[PDB]
Scaffold this active site. Structure first.
Site, short mmCIF file in Angstrom:
data_model
loop_
_atom_site.label_atom_id
_atom_site.label_comp_id
_atom_site.label_asym_id
_atom_site.label_seq_id
_atom_site.Cartn_x
_atom_site.Cartn_y
_atom_site.Cartn_z
N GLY A 45 62.92 42.39 60.34
CA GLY A 45 61.59 41.89 59.12
C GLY A 45 61.58 40.23 58.24
O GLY A 45 63.16 40.33 57.69
N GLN A 50 61.00 34.71 51.33
CA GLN A 50 62.57 34.68 50.92
C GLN A 50 62.78 33.60 51.78
O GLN A 50 63.93 33.43 51.18
CB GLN A 50 62.83 36.00 52.18
CG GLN A 50 62.86 36.91 51.84
CD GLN A 50 63.30 37.93 52.75
OE1 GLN A 50 62.35 39.04 53.42
NE2 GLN A 50 64.06 38.41 52.85
N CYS A 90 68.59 44.41 52.46
CA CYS A 90 67.06 42.92 52.41
C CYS A 90 68.19 41.82 52.38
O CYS A 90 69.78 41.68 52.14
CB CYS A 90 66.65 42.87 51.23
SG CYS A 90 65.73 41.49 51.11
N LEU A 91 68.22 40.60 53.66
CA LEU A 91 68.37 39.80 53.49
C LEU A 91 68.90 38.61 51.98
O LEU A 91 70.42 37.84 52.11
CB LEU A 91 68.05 38.79 54.49
CG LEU A 91 68.05 38.93 55.73
CD1 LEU A 91 67.63 38.44 56.55
CD2 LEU A 91 69.34 38.82 56.67
N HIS A 132 58.62 47.03 53.26
CA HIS A 132 58.98 46.06 52.84
C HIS A 132 58.24 44.90 52.75
O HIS A 132 58.99 44.15 51.51
CB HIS A 132 60.19 46.72 53.22
CG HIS A 132 61.75 45.22 52.63
ND1 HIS A 132 63.04 46.40 52.14
CD2 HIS A 132 62.16 44.41 52.98
CE1 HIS A 132 63.52 44.77 51.86
NE2 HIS A 132 63.17 43.89 52.22
N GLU A 133 58.01 44.59 53.57
CA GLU A 133 57.63 43.15 54.30
C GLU A 133 56.43 42.19 52.86
O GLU A 133 56.71 41.62 52.43
CB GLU A 133 57.10 43.30 55.63
CG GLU A 133 59.03 42.81 55.99
CD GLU A 133 60.43 42.38 55.47
OE1 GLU A 133 59.96 40.60 55.36
OE2 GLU A 133 61.49 42.57 55.71
N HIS A 136 57.74 42.16 49.44
CA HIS A 136 58.31 40.89 49.26
C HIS A 136 56.93 39.52 49.28
O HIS A 136 57.21 38.56 48.37
CB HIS A 136 58.35 39.82 50.77
CG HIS A 136 60.24 40.43 50.83
ND1 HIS A 136 61.24 39.90 50.28
CD2 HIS A 136 60.79 40.80 51.60
CE1 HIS A 136 62.45 40.11 49.75
NE2 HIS A 136 62.47 41.12 51.25
CO LIG Z 1 63.40 41.91 52.37
#
Ligand SMILES: [Co+2]
Ligand SMILES: CCCC[C@H](OP(=O)(O)O)C(=O)N[C@@H](CC(C)C)C(=O)Nc1ccc([N+](=O)[O-])cc1
EC number: 3.5.1.88
Length: 166
Positions: A45, A50, A90-91, A132-133, A136
């Site tokens: 995702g 981000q 998470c990236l 999660h997304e 963000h």
């Molecule tokens: Co993330």
């Protein structure tokens, strides 16, 4: 084309994204750029925040074959229930993973790539990913659910990790 993913600590990851006024060619190019970046990093995702684009856009692909694109423009949570959790990553927080409490089921409403609305009932991993997304988009990261001590640890680790990798 691949976009650059911000890592903590970067205040830009805490900016609340604004709603997409009109889904068009530009928005679509962003959507495609995001998928390319997500797949490139092997993520399941990716929220627009981000990649430093402050608009409510999310791309997801929780499939094994990695060819099932889900787009959530202007997502909206309608219902949520149950409890579950997994070792999320998470990236934007390289190499850290932590069990985060999430709702098991989640019903949402959003716009697809063409700006057409749809409603989705999700559970399992897809439900978790969505939560999660969406966090963000409102500047919330998964580490905020942990005790301050754990949060500080994480910051020290990523901070260090990044500096050495430069
Ligand atoms: Co993330
Ligand atoms: C946590 C829901 C996904 C959100 C994250 O995507 P972005 O960084 O926002 C991601 O893709 N994280 C990956 C690791 C990342 C560094 C590539 C992740 O945590 N995946 C993952 C997949 C499956 C399971 N699992 O338990 O089946 C756990 C975690």
């Amino acid at each position: 084309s691949v976009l650059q993913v911000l890592h903590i600590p970067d205040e830009r990851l805490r900016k609340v994204a604004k709603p997409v006024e009109e889904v068009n060619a530009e928005i679509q190019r962003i959507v495609d750029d995001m998928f390319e970046t997500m797949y490139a990093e092997e993520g399941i995702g990716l929220a627009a925040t981000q990649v430093d684009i402050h608009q409510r856009i999310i791309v997801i692909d929780v499939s094994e074959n990695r060819d099932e694109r889900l787009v959530l423009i202007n997502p909206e949570l309608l219902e949520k229930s149950g409890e579950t959790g997994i070792e999320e990553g998470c990236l934007s927080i390289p190499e850290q993973r932590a069990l985060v409490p999430r709702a098991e089921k989640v019903k949402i409403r959003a716009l697809d790539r063409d700006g057409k609305p749809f409603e989705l009932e999700a559970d399992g991993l897809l439900a978790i990913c969505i939560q999660h997304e969406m966090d963000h988009l409102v500047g919330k990261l998964f580490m905020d659910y942990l005790s301050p001590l754990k949060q500080q640890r994480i910051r020290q680790k990523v901070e260090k990790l990044d500096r050495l990798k430069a």
